Design an enzyme around this catalytic site. Structure first.
Site, short mmCIF file in Angstrom:
data_model
loop_
_atom_site.label_atom_id
_atom_site.label_comp_id
_atom_site.label_asym_id
_atom_site.label_seq_id
_atom_site.Cartn_x
_atom_site.Cartn_y
_atom_site.Cartn_z
CG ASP A 122 -13.34 9.21 -5.02
OD1 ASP A 122 -12.12 9.42 -4.87
OD2 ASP A 122 -14.02 8.68 -4.12
CD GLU A 147 -3.17 -0.58 0.15
OE1 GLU A 147 -3.10 0.53 -0.43
OE2 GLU A 147 -4.09 -1.39 -0.07
CG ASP A 179 -16.43 -1.47 7.38
OD1 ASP A 179 -17.11 -0.67 6.70
OD2 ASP A 179 -15.59 -2.24 6.87
CG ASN A 194 -8.33 7.32 -4.34
OD1 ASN A 194 -8.44 7.54 -3.13
ND2 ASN A 194 -7.56 6.36 -4.81
#
EC number: 3.2.1.17
Length: 129
Positions: free
Chosen positions: A48, A35, A101, A46
């Site tokens: 977005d 990463e 999550d 990114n």
């Protein structure tokens, strides 16, 4: 700060990541390697408009506030800058929330594509832990 392989394994172990939610230490070290290449200062934008920060490339769309990702949630309640520190504590505590999550470590694309199903124990081979 750019961590050495065993140095990071050791710090993560101390922060309770070894076997957190069933994921052995090798998984976390492998994810960090791919990463951010063990660099706490890594950032990546990114398409977005959101940005990934730190050793575990945590995203500003859901986890931290960077003041430039409209309509993002700050689920870890921290400025994204805290995730770039030499001290991995903020990154670790936030990662524990992400991995809990529902989707597990699949939340990390590099983990899913480069660590998942491989011999992750190799990432901690040789380290005095």
């Amino acid at each position: 700060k750019v961590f050495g392989r065993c140095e990071l394994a050791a710090a993560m172990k101390r922060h309770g990541l070894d076997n957190y939610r069933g994921y052995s230490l090798g998984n976390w070290v492998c994810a960090a390697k791919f990463e951010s290449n063990f660099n706490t200062q890594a950032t990546n934008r990114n398409t977005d408009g959101s940005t990934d920060y730190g050793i575990l490339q945590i995203n500003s769309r859901w986890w931290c506030n960077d003041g430039r990702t409209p309509g993002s949630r700050n689920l870890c309640n921290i400025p994204c800058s805290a995730l770039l520190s030499s001290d991995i504590t903020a990154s670790v505590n936030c990662a524990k929330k992400i991995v809990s999550d529902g989707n597990g470590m699949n939340a990390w694309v590099a983990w899913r594509n480069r660590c998942k199903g491989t011999d992750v124990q190799a990432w901690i081979r040789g380290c005095r832990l």
